[PDB]
Symmetry: D2
Subunit: 481 residues, 4 copies
């Protein structure tokens, strides 16, 4: 084996170490070729055909770029080839646990199918990695290239999921703390995963990326902070970091939480729920699993991809009729209809335990308007989206360390007020989207009256088109006009 | 219904007439979301996740751009909204007939599975279109927007496949001949289909596109030629057209005929052949079809997509064991091994009827070299690739008409010698690639000796690495050194 | 004359009407080829070689695109070819009044050379346009293409500079009010001038543009607002518009107000001041003007371009020695040294009449630190930069009208709270940069102590590197640590 | 001093070693900011505002990239930091000798102004470099960073201009021969200068670049050839190299030799000739030089830039009236008129000594057509352009060495027949453009008849529009029809 070159449209010609090639050329990794990065987003942005596979290559490549750059600027860090490979592998492998349609699976489907369980793609990534290594005889190959499986496998997993439980990490000591900031940055979210997806998603979406990660890499240094060696950014680059998060939020607003992309994810989730009892996936020793239980056996999970969607759509089994009909409505574009969007007011905040009760509230609103049809709870979908800068109410730039050019080894902190008054005063918010499952003209007219009445009753913000869609409702509320 | 905007990364925001939206929002069209544009190319160029769906939107959009541009410059043509919609629809629908992995299906699989039949994706596109229209009640909608289904459906089909049988076309008269040059140009190959794929494939492959179709559109005019109204290009743009074909050939060399992408297509084709007797696809009236017979029923063909690959890979049926093993070798990257490439010499040309005999010739070559293993015909794959400028030996620019700025209505012809001495003297060639199905070191060493000996025996060109891979063979041939 | 095609790297092949070509092919327009768009920015961003000429073509092109798009969607507007040409000409010509190094000239040099006068590039553009028309016999040509010079010339000028004095405009009636929003939008700043420069500046700077103007054009409509017909944006696009201004501000922060680009502009301005008494420019009737007086005669102004810089640099006249020495320091990169940046606190705001007093305040600060040198007022430069969303304290989105898809003819308003909590709470701020003209190590050390002491005395924000550059000063201030 | 980062739109963030910064920040280098890369090309392609300065940075950067890549792949080469800096400096400095409007100066102006002398920009680059070093005290700084001025300055100059006189180079021994292939490749033309300009010129022109230099860098290796260590390319990349030269030729055809860009260069050259006796440039010791003699004194040459054009255009001196009038015709776009283009037939080849006689031949042609005006030799311009693959009749790929993957250290040769039949059979040709200085309708009509008659008399190829512009002339020639 010698090193391979891959041509990526985002990053150009990437060199892959033979050990990485060996990890990549497994069923567990190749699986990511059949999982769309953006799930239902492809049904709205037709350029978004890209899959988790190529994103993972890019994350692995950027992880290598950063660790290499730091080692070249600061030989005193003693970054070894072994460290580089471990960081690259963690980069490559942090998406292994994604399910069909990526975030739809762990964001919508598992929560509803297995409410008692707490599962994340991160957990899944660790499990799949363990399975990948064991199933494919990778430990010997790691040894051949100077890695120490006991320590290094632990390191890799900690990079992905954090401490598997003071310095809480075992795979590397505090002297190498900065290595944990590269692939999945638990402190402030600034990691090479974002950098690849910003660039790649934009390339495919037809939206232009505002963040320059190569510049950031050039200005990054390691400095001592509170007895840890941490990655620090040049002080004057602080604006670029606020911009990075602004970019992320804009991508969510325009693409990842697109009102129609979300309703398609919701419809697909509904079909999966209705198919769950009848689709069988063979795991370890020939034992059969369901869509919702494949997460318990990585052999089965390996075979759980976007292909599930087509298996359902092309099924003839009468058991799968209801699931198959939902997917067919997607193909004819007979989708649940968007009614509108609103936000809570003041401090008001909506908890996950209350999500299920919301369609019922909308249906209970009693607008003083003439209605041909009366709508029930089950006719309404209410999608609640938490938007933030990756840390709920917290400002992630308050968790970033900087250095100045006159003292490159001395870490400092920068407050929001030292940067600009034009920055946000809050860093988290909720959006509520309401959809109606009844798509005819009269139902939709009615749904609009309920929705706007409910906004008024709850003292939510005025929907943007409120006066046009519900002119008889909006005048009752002084604050709106 | 009103017009929709779609954001395409190649063309930007494209407007779609509601009738086009109706055609698009059918199972027959949406199917193209699950067929990779470049087939096995994705297994070499990881950016090439793109599917035929989005390419078809682009072709439909460009077809509209060109017909609109001509109408705006020359009102005297009397191009109607009806003409525009018909040309857009033909553009949208000329890829409907592609099968799993696009050109792998009609270029490799069908020729081997059903040797007696002549089938093309073009034929398939017409059949699928008819099925699309009838299955979805589109004729009434066409009438609602001013189309005349009898004439216009005929027109659309002729744009895709040519005369369904002097002026040989029935869907439009000679006065509108130029409309037939837009979507699928049978005279010289210069059409909007190429223009989309150059741009789109380059964007995804990470290769840069050298042809400017927007410029071409600006300089296009309709002029009278031999009692037909034909699209003519500005004389000075002739170099750009030679460049267009040069670009196409370069894309084939670098990407579409990549030696490994082709062997992957070949391996997938082999798996499909071994699965063909056991995979069943439900068509009209519940009747069951095979992969190779789904082309006879469009209802079944609608459900024949790349998903077949994963159906096989994830199968547990022992009948599909051999097919499934081939796909598993792809995932582990245990691929048939490339041995080398060579070309015929002089006038020598290789016909399709002789393809099957070639592995046998390679195995019959008797290199005077010491060999541990002896290889048989079935161990060798010989892939013969015809490279041309789209017209076999013919120069397509000899079939283009031009105009000069001093007389914009007067069509003229341009010879190669009026353009440049730096153009090719021939416009067609064949490449022969040889691969070995036995992948071990000793088999591959042997395969190299056979291959190079066979090249010498047949008086083919010297493989580039011939002296290195077969130093004991190459000296016998004077011409090579 | 017939229409010309120009290839622009930003917009592609642009068609120019022959009348526009005639306006372009004059000394008054061609002059823009020798004025850098970004002035001193080229000395920091080497890709920023671009000149106002090519920007002006782009603004003229986009002005045409928008007016065409509106006319195509709404024939009821009665937009004529005459209206289109007038809007294009205003677009082409709104940059005619720029001086050497663009905003350096009217932002720094004229204010200091002719403090009593109020001049702007806008005024200059009108004057230069009048001169262009009269000097080149353009009125007859305008008549030949259906324009009415009396009304249309007035219209064009009003599009550039606003009312030359209710409906305050004379060139077109209220029915055509929306035409005034295209080239230079006085109501909210959203115009095609921004759109070209975002795209063009980013292309040359090596920074990526976040705003999609083509999308905006597709969703724009004209609706009635307060008895005017105004351009309205689709409601859901409101986020994109906030993003547009965010992008503008980011471009200012990264490029247009780059600390070193600004000091170069300042040094060039200083050289121009020292050269002003000696450089002579011939205007009308052979009369001689100065750099600072060329604005009074358009014949002289025509010959006032970036070339002035080189005329000074290459001069041998001993009178110009001091000016020439400043420019030579630029070439050797011996620039005034950046000391730091800070901002006012709370409501504090700094007026233009106080700018001159600021170096004196810095020099008067008395840091308790050991200093080798003592610095004087004239050793300090204080640059005050007003950053906003184009309307001082005002939110420009409050001055935008929207429409919803259920009632496309009905204009509505959207408040900030209807959009997001993650938007700025303020829309204007000031940055203060301090530089030292003494560049040696000890002077700069001292300058840092004065600067930080002055920030502390004035209760400005703590400079980012304050603790590193002035560790003995920063502890006295509680608020900073 | 520490290393600086510059943001280039083509290459991104480039790091500059402090020694390079010191070389850059001199009047001799900064001069390149005022010399357009493409000369008169900007007057046809408005995006082509770029100057030689930024190109030189890119060449210096790519030179560094390649030498670094080779050192990283092959430590055994013993490439030192000293070698890297020398190669970077040669890259940075190979354009120092360009004059106003780049190739216009040494391609058109000097040959006509000083016919007896042989001068090239290469020679000029060496002289300017020597002047840069000596004028700015760079030798001590070189020593400070480990360079040995005696050997290294010699090396740098040899990289630029070749041997200043068996191994003919003195700055480095044969073991380092491959270092001479990087900045200016005298063996086959494949160097980093091309790579920058392809990318940069395309970015500005609005034409898309077909060559991937990063890929080439990845596949480059050093191998022994004929007792030299040379840079070798991977065998299979041979097609990419043919494509590189094809791209270069296409860029010449579309842009660098654009018929109107060339006539603008020609008109500027004419103005310079008429201004040459009156413009004075101060050189060493206050001595005065002319445009045409500034090449003899680098102090004067330092001040000779594109600014000369504006000095002439803005002059009031009656001596410069004729020169100034030519430039004014450019501004009004009253340009010499293109008549047509033709090529020699067979082996026919046109020598430089015969260029002056050609307008006289055109004027002597006696077309049997009715003419209002009779034209004289001085009314015609004949521009002869030699197009090749950089080596006259020779195929540069015959002078490239390759390696195969089975033996990466073993250099091999590849013939054209081993690559493709679709390649050119010849690698050089001449284009002849004829223009008329009399621009009225009747003169141009006449000029066309003379031109086509002269083509017929000389047995040149038929102009493309010949039948349209000269219908009464073309029938006499059988071969043409
Ligand atoms: N001319 C090209 N330009 C850009 N990318 C290319 C080109 N040819 C191939 N690629 C892409 C496809 C792959 O992603 C990557 C590696 O391809 P390539 O170098 O052909 O690998 P290979 O494995 O076929 O070569 P090798 O024969 O040495 O193993 O580069
Ligand atoms: N709701 C969604 N809809 C569509 N795509 C999504 C959604 N959520 C995430 N994605 C996609 C887009 C991104 O490229 C990618 C981000 O998720 P992932 O790659 O797991 O990193 P992450 O979990 O750290 O995300 P983040 O950057 O938000 O922290 O997944
Ligand atoms: N082959 C090409 N590909 C891309 N852009 C080009 C090409 N040739 C020219 N351009 C650019 C340069 C100009 O901005 C614009 C117009 O060029 P061109 O068509 O040659 O005008 P022209 O005035 O010389 O031709 P004509 O003889 O038609 O008047 O296009
Ligand atoms: N925010 C930015 N984003 C992208 N590129 C930038 C940005 N700021 C500057 N550049 C570019 C322009 C310059 O050519 C190059 C260096 O600029 P910059 O880092 O500001 O150096 P500088 O010398 O002004 O700062 P300092 O000397 O404090 O390090 O990078
Ligand atoms: Mg390989
Ligand atoms: Mg919609
Ligand atoms: Mg022209
Ligand atoms: Mg700096």
């Amino acid at each position: 084996d010698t090193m391979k070159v891959i041509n990526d449209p985002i990053h150009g010609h990437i060199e892959l170490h033979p050990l990485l090639v060996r990890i990549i050329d497994t069923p567990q990794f190749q699986r990511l070729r059949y999982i769309k990065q953006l799930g239902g987003g492809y049904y709205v942005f037709p350029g978004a055909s890209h899959n988790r596979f190529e994103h993972s290559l890019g994350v692995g490549y950027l992880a290598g770029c950063l660790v290499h750059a730091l080692g070249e600027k600061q030989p005193e860090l003693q970054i070894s080839e072994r460290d580089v490979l471990c960081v690259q592998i963690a980069g490559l492998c942090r998406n292994l646990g994604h399910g069909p349609f990526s975030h739809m699976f762990d964001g919508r489907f598992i929560p509803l199918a297995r409410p008692e369980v707490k599962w994340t793609h991160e957990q899944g990534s660790v499990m799949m990695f363990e399975h990948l290594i064991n199933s494919n005889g990778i430990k010997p190959v790691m040894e051949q290239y100077g890695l120490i499986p006991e320590e290094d496998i632990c390191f890799i997993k900690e990079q992905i999921v954090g401490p598997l439980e003071l310095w809480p990490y075992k795979g590397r000591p505090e002297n190498k703390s900065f290595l944990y900031e590269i692939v999945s940055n638990k402190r402030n979210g600034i990691d090479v995963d974002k950098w690849d997806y910003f660039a790649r998603d934009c390339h495919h979406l037809g939206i232009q990326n505002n963040f320059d990660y190569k510049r950031f890499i050039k200005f990054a240094r390691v400095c001592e902070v509170d007895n840890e060696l941490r990655i620090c950014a040049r002080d004057k680059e602080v604006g670029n970091l606020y911009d990075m998060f602004h970019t992320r939020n804009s991508l969510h607003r325009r693409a990842y939480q697109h009102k129609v992309g979300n309703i398609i994810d919701t419809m697909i989730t509904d079909a999966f729920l209705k198919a769950d009892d009848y689709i069988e996936i063979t795991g370890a020793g020939g034992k059969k699993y369901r869509i919702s239980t494949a997460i318990d056996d990585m052999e089965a999970y390996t075979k759980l991809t976007d292909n599930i969607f087509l298996e359902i759509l092309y099924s003839t089994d009468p058991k799968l009729k209801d699931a198959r009909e939902i997917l067919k409505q997607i193909e004819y574009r007979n989708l649940f209809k968007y009614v509108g969007e609103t936000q809570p007011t003041g401090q008001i905040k909506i908890k996950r335990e209350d999500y299920e009760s919301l369609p019922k509230e909308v249906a209970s609103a009693k607008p003083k308007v003439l209605l041909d049809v009366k709508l029930k709870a089950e006719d309404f979908i209410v999608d609640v989206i938490n938007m933030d800068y990756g840390m709920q109410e917290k400002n992630p730039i308050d968790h970033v360390s900087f250095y100045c050019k006159t003292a490159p080894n001395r870490a400092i902190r920068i407050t929001k007020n030292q940067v600009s008054q034009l920055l946000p005063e809050k860093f988290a918010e909720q959006l509520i989207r309401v959809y109606c499952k009844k798509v005819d003209r009269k139902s939709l007219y009615a749904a609009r009256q309920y929705f706007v009445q409910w906004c008024a009753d709850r003292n939510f913000t005025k929907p943007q088109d409120g006066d046009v869609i519900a002119p008889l409702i909006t005048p009752q509320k002084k604050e709106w006009n």
